[PDB]
Design a protein around this ligand. Structure first.
Ligand SMILES: [Mg+2]
Ligand SMILES: [Mg+2]
Ligand SMILES: [Mg+2]
Ligand SMILES: [Mg+2]
Ligand SMILES: [Mg+2]
Ligand SMILES: [Mg+2]
Ligand SMILES: [Mg+2]
Ligand SMILES: [Mg+2]
Ligand SMILES: [Mg+2]
Ligand SMILES: [Mg+2]
Ligand SMILES: [Mg+2]
Ligand SMILES: [Mg+2]
Ligand SMILES: [Mg+2]
Ligand SMILES: [Mg+2]
Ligand SMILES: [Mg+2]
Ligand SMILES: [Mg+2]
Ligand SMILES: [Mg+2]
Ligand SMILES: [Mg+2]
Ligand SMILES: [Mg+2]
Ligand SMILES: [Mg+2]
Ligand SMILES: [Mg+2]
Ligand SMILES: [Mg+2]
Ligand SMILES: [Mg+2]
Ligand SMILES: [Mg+2]
Ligand SMILES: [Mg+2]
Ligand SMILES: [Mg+2]
Ligand SMILES: [Mg+2]
Ligand SMILES: [Mg+2]
Ligand SMILES: [Mg+2]
Ligand SMILES: [Mg+2]
Ligand SMILES: [Mg+2]
Ligand SMILES: [Mg+2]
Ligand SMILES: [Mg+2]
Ligand SMILES: [Mg+2]
Ligand SMILES: [Mg+2]
Ligand SMILES: [Mg+2]
Ligand SMILES: [Mg+2]
Ligand SMILES: [Mg+2]
Ligand SMILES: [Mg+2]
Ligand SMILES: [Mg+2]
Ligand SMILES: [Mg+2]
Ligand SMILES: [Mg+2]
Ligand SMILES: [Mg+2]
Ligand SMILES: [Mg+2]
Ligand SMILES: [Mg+2]
Ligand SMILES: [Mg+2]
Ligand SMILES: [Mg+2]
Ligand SMILES: [Mg+2]
Ligand SMILES: [Mg+2]
Lengths: 64, 201, 117, 144
RNA sequence: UAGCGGCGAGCGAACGGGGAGCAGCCCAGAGCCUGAAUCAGUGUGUGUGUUAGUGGAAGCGUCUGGAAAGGCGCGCGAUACAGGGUGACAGCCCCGUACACAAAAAUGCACAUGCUGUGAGCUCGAUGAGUAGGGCGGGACACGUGGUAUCCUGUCUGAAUAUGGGGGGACCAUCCUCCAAGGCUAAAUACUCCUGACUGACCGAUAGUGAACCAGUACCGUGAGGGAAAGGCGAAAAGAACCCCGGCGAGGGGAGUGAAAAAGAACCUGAAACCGUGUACGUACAAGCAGUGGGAGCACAGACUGUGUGACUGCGUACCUUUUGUAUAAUGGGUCAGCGACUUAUAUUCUGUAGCAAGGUUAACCGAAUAGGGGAGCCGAAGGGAAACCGAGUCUUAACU
RNA sequence: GCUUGACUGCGAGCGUGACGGCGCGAGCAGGUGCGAAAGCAGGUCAUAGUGAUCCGGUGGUUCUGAAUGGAAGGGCCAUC
């Protein structure tokens, strides 16, 4: 039967123009006041999935 | 494209695409193979170790007897056990793209014209529904193994054919690539050729 | 598509057994053993084609030594003399000559001695 | 051309791996699974995104965003699709009849993609700046 | 997909579209006109099946052979060359097949018709109360209580009643849509203990059913229950009269049958393990994976080389598995024969290959059926953004060098 | 002594990690502090002082809002 998607992965990843995946950075969720503003700013924008974990993401998201 | 007729010795114009294209062997082969696969029926089944009739109790205790460790009497490695990968009934029908099928037909038709196995005539009717008459007509036409393709459906012709196993009479709608390749010669009526051209385009 | 495998299996076994004819006991009667034996024989044969070359050279050298000493010269000296004299006769031939033609061998030895000194 | 003269193209059919048929085969005793592990086992292996236990990437990283229901009912049209309709008026209904946009599509946009040669009247559709310019150049008309 | 979900593992719609099939009615009720349509049972007539059946074409000569259906000649039938038998492979020898016919009787399904019950149409009405909601506890909806709509109810309550009420995914207003608390209803859908016909890139006696055979038997178990093994003489018994050895044996040798009995019922073929008889060569001073390289002699077969044996001699510690590493005194195997393990379906990606190409392809289904229709859909030709939205750009930011 | 640069948006380019990430960073825009000015300031001589995701809480919002207008809920930003 149809392959099922890993719904968590679906929530966390979105495919881009060539077939990458952007994702939201970790560590910008709670205790923030100790984190430096520069660090927070850098974490804020989205980020492409690296070469190492691309395969795993692909496995997770067969219909992405 | 132009096919001269046997009976009137008059030409008949046809499409170069339909009757004068190249023979794409790979495509034709795929279509014929597909036809064969479709024709098969595929009804069989073995019994898995699940389905083999017997109890599901352990033939002997795991340890102690010194025998090798057995779990079910229905094991595939046991005599009268299940077939390991027992078959089920399956559908062997391959899909063939419409265009691919049409192209294959076109190639086969072209090959026939080149090889002089397509014989076009104005009309191939028999007067009575008599095998003897059909046989005589075929002899007169020199023919023995032949696919007679007709435009309009003929009762006398079909009945006459029925008992000649080398002979087969079809309607132009019901032609098939394996049949065309198989039969030594193919005798199309003028209406039939025209109809085929219309069908194939 | 139930491919019964009697005929092929027996033919295969028979070929191996035939190859293992002349072996003691189950090594010529019982397939498992015969096959093991056949493989072993193959391995030995490969080894021994090499060893055959080695052995025959050894034999030739022994014979030549005996002959040369009979004509009053050691093998090593004789070979050196021949090399010096530019005689390219290989020692299979030298051994044969020694065995079957004492005059020829003696002549060769004389040549070697002269070349040596 | 007989039923015993046809043959496939070279490279069309390839040999099907058969595991565990002796030494010469290549795929011998073990069948290309190496030596006894979990992956070696029949049924063996670990589910998608499993990292030995490490929090897997699809969990490490935070969830984000939401799904728009209006996006499911929006659509994007091309100038080649402005030519693919019939007539000289591009409504939703006309586009749908043409089979360009989906049936449950309340909104559509004409984007500068491809090119429009014939004059077309885009009615009740959003049109991008490039597309609008292109249509006007073609000799078209846009109206709300 | 949207959603649900220790937001894990997993579960997973609906709206809308294409098809198959399409049938709508009745009571909560009385006045009128009233046997009025429909439905059910029951007789009768007709048609068409079903349960026995009838007819059903056309070939001989010759060779081989135990036997012709085979070879080689010359003919004939075919709306019949499906299939099965007959001394080897038969269109024409037999049974059939195509095709054309057949029912005293019983009965299925159609109409036609008679009888019985059944009640149509109009006007006026009436419009399902411990019910809908609610509180508490559970359950069902893709929906795990969550912001949770909707459905069911164990418990405690409890309306309005068309000037009315339900729903539109917390909730309110507006708008739209429908009328709960009473019923009936064919088709398209599911299945095969069983009956008939036909088919198979299904098996062919360790296979296929457990069971080709007197099998759910023998046997095992107190019992529920478990549960085998075991097919083949020959074309035809022509199954061996008679004689002989032997215990008026068993078994055998003649005889006879037969194409063949080394086809004799312990019966087609008749492998291997295993066990013998005969012949050649070797072997009783010689130490080990038993072979291999060299190699004398001896025997045989042909005119020296083939074959068989192998004195003596160099080298040489099986195989598998598992291991850093095995001759290992680590595992497994007494041997032989048969069987015994990377499959199948559906999704997805990449590679090859074929078709068409900014297009490609159809799914159910329909179909004088692998044709043709069917483009509902799906993938692609546009991306960016969480989204609104913008768009060859877009997002970020007040703005970006 | 005077102050709040213990700024906001970004950031060429590097370092270090299998990755999650972590680190250094001139310069640009806005707005400030000290200095006469050149200048310096995006915490502390540097290297420890820490905890992913989920699920919620609080505030803001030119996003969304299941007939429509709202709202709930969701998103985004800050934070617990
Ligand atoms: Mg936050
Ligand atoms: Mg039990
Ligand atoms: Mg079985
Ligand atoms: Mg089709
Ligand atoms: Mg390999
Ligand atoms: Mg290998
Ligand atoms: Mg592998
Ligand atoms: Mg192993
Ligand atoms: Mg290991
Ligand atoms: Mg491994
Ligand atoms: Mg398993
Ligand atoms: Mg469409
Ligand atoms: Mg009869
Ligand atoms: Mg007959
Ligand atoms: Mg004959
Ligand atoms: Mg015979
Ligand atoms: Mg009511
Ligand atoms: Mg209630
Ligand atoms: Mg409620
Ligand atoms: Mg209700
Ligand atoms: Mg609402
Ligand atoms: Mg047998
Ligand atoms: Mg059995
Ligand atoms: Mg049996
Ligand atoms: Mg007695
Ligand atoms: Mg007797
Ligand atoms: Mg026999
Ligand atoms: Mg026998
Ligand atoms: Mg034997
Ligand atoms: Mg001795
Ligand atoms: Mg000894
Ligand atoms: Mg010899
Ligand atoms: Mg030796
Ligand atoms: Mg190893
Ligand atoms: Mg060890
Ligand atoms: Mg060793
Ligand atoms: Mg051992
Ligand atoms: Mg082992
Ligand atoms: Mg053992
Ligand atoms: Mg694949
Ligand atoms: Mg491909
Ligand atoms: Mg100043
Ligand atoms: Mg410090
Ligand atoms: Mg979690
Ligand atoms: Mg939770
Ligand atoms: Mg909030
Ligand atoms: Mg709004
Ligand atoms: Mg709304
Ligand atoms: Mg809100």
């Amino acid at each position: 039967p149809k392959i099922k998607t890993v719904r968590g992965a679906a929530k966390r990843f979105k495919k881009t123009g060539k077939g990458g995946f952007k994702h939201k950075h970790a560590n910008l969720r709670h205790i923030l006041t100790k984190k430096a503003t520069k660090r927070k700013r850098h974490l804020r924008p989205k980020a492409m999935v690296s070469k190492g974990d691309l395969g795993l993401v692909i496995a997770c998201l067969p219909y992405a | 494209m132009e096919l001269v007729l046997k009976d009137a010795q008059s030409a008949l114009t046809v499409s170069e695409t339909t009757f004068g294209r190249d023979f794409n062997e790979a495509l034709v082969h795929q279509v014929v193979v597909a036809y064969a696969a479709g024709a098969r029926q595929g009804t069989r089944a073995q019994k898995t170790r699940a389905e083999v009739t017997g109890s599901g109790k352990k033939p002997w205790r795991q340890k102690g007897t010194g025998r090798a460790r057995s779990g079910s009497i229905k094991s595939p490695i046991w005599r009268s056990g299940g077939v390991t990968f027992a078959a089920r009934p399956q559908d062997h029908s391959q899909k063939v793209n419409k265009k691919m099928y049409r192209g294959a037909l076109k190639s086969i038709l072209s090959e026939l014209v080149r090889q002089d196995r397509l014989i076009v005539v104005e009309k191939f009717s028999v007067e009575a529904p008599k095998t003897k008459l059909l046989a005589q007509k075929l002899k007169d036409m020199a023919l023995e193994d032949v696919l007679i393709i007709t435009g309009e459906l003929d009762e006398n012709l079909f009945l006459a054919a029925r008992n000649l196993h080398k002979v087969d009479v079809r309607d132009a709608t019901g032609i098939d690539p394996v049949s065309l390749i198989a039969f030594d010669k193919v005798v199309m009526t003028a209406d039939a050729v025209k109809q085929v051209e219309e069908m194939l385009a | 598509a139930r491919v019964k495998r009697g005929v092929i299996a027996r033919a295969r076994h028979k070929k191996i057994l035939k190859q293992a004819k002349g072996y003691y006991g189950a090594r010529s009667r019982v397939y498992r053993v015969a096959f093991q034996a056949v493989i072993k024989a193959g391995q030995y044969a490969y080894r021994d084609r090499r060893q055959r070359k080695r052995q025959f050279r050894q034999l030739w050298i022994a014979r030549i030594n005996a002959a040369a000493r009979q004509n009053g010269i050691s093998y090593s000296k004789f070979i050196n003399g021949l090399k010096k004299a530019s005689v390219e006769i290989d020692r299979k031939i030298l051994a044969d000559i020694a065995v079957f033609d004492k005059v020829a061998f003696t002549a060769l030895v004389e040549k070697a001695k002269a070349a040596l000194a | 051309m007989r039923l015993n003269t046809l043959s496939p193209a070279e490279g069309s059919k390839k040999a099907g791996k058969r595991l565990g048929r002796g030494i010469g085969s290549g795929l011998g005793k073990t069948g290309g699974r190496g030596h006894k592990g979990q992956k070696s086992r029949s049924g063996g292996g670990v589910r998608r995104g499993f990292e030995g236990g490490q929090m897997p990437l699809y969990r490490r990283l935070p969830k984000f965003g939401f799904t728009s229901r209006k996006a499911a009912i929006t659509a994007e049209v091309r100038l080649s699709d402005l030519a693919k309709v019939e007539g000289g008026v591009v409504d939703l209904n006309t586009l749908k009849a043409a089979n360009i946009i989906g049936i449950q599509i309340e909104f559509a946009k004409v984007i500068l993609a491809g090119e429009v040669t014939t004059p077309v009247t885009v009615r009740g559709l959003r049109v991008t700046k490039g597309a609008r310019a292109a249509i006007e150049a073609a000799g078209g008309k846009i109206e709300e």
